[PDB]
Amino acid sequence: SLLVKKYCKMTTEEIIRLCNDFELPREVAYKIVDEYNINASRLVCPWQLVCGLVLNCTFIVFNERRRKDPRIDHFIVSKMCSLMLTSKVDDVIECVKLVKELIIGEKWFRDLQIRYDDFDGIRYDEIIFRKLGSMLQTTNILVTDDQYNIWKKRIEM
DNA sequence: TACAGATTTTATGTTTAGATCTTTTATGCTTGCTTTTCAAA
Numbered sequence: 001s002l003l004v005k006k007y008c009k010m011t012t013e014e015i016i017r018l019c020n021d022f023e024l025p026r027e028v029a030y031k032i033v034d035e036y037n038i039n040a041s042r043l044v045c046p047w048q049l050v051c052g053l054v055l056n057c058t059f060i061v062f063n064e065r066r067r068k069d070p071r072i073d074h075f076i077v078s079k080m081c082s083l084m085l086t087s088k089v090d091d092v093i094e095c096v097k098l099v100k101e102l103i104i105g106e107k108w109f110r111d112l113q114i115r116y117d118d119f120d121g122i123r124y125d126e127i128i129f130r131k132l133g134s135m136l137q138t139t140n141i142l143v144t145d146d147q148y149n150i151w152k153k154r155i156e157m
Numbered sequence: 158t159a160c161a162g163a164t165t166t167t168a169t170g171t172t173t174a175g176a177t178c179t180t181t182t183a184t185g186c187t188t189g190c191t192t193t194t195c196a197a198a
Contacts, residue, residue: 007196044196 002047002084003091010036010046018050021083022058022076031108032057051084051092052099060118068146 012033019029032053036046043049058076059066066072080092103109113119119127129137143151 001086001091003045003051003086003095005047006045008046010050015050018083019054019057021079022054022062024054024057024061028057028061028112031112035103035108047084048095049099051080052096053103055080055092055096056100056103057112060112060116063116063118063121067144 015033015036016029019032024032032050035053036050039049055076059073062072062076077089077092081087081089084092086092117123122130126138
């Protein structure tokens with residue numbers, strides 16, 4: 001598996017072509033390249049770092065269609081194990097959980113979360129009522145209005 | 158004015174909460190030396 005081999009050396013072309021497999025814009029891929037170039041000589045398994053960075057970027061870039069459809073979350077992680085030569089899925093989840101704490105406090109990741117409105121999966125208007133202890137926050141019991149509208153369109157079609 | 162009772166004043170004892178200083182002991186930095194896994198060939 002690609003998550004096991006150590007001390008690999010990579011080119012910029014491999015990183016920028018692996019970034020375009022998941023449909024990322026140019027500046028996000030450039031920030032992924034720069035985050036790799038900062039920690040170039042102080043790295044053990046670069047494939048894990050690149051995999052988890054392109055993951056944590058493509059949940060943020062594709063959060064709204066993940067809210068539209070949940071199985072895309074099972075589609076991006078299925079595309080990753082079909083490229084990283086890894087049989088199981090839990091290694092990729094532990095990989096992204098491990099690389100998440102390395103970029104959490106940085107300015108570019110904060111600006112990405114601001115610009116694409118991810119904030120660990122929910123809007124600012126929802127997270128400011130969840131942290132305040134507002135009981136009037138939207139609970140995860142009923143479906144959303146857009147989901148009800150597209151379901152009613154599916155019924156009428 | 159006048160005296161009985163209530164309250165204040167002054168004085169001392171009892172117990173608790175806490176400060177300050179002193180002494181002995183733990184701990185952390187410094188320097189030198191030796192062990193032991195780690196990225197590279």
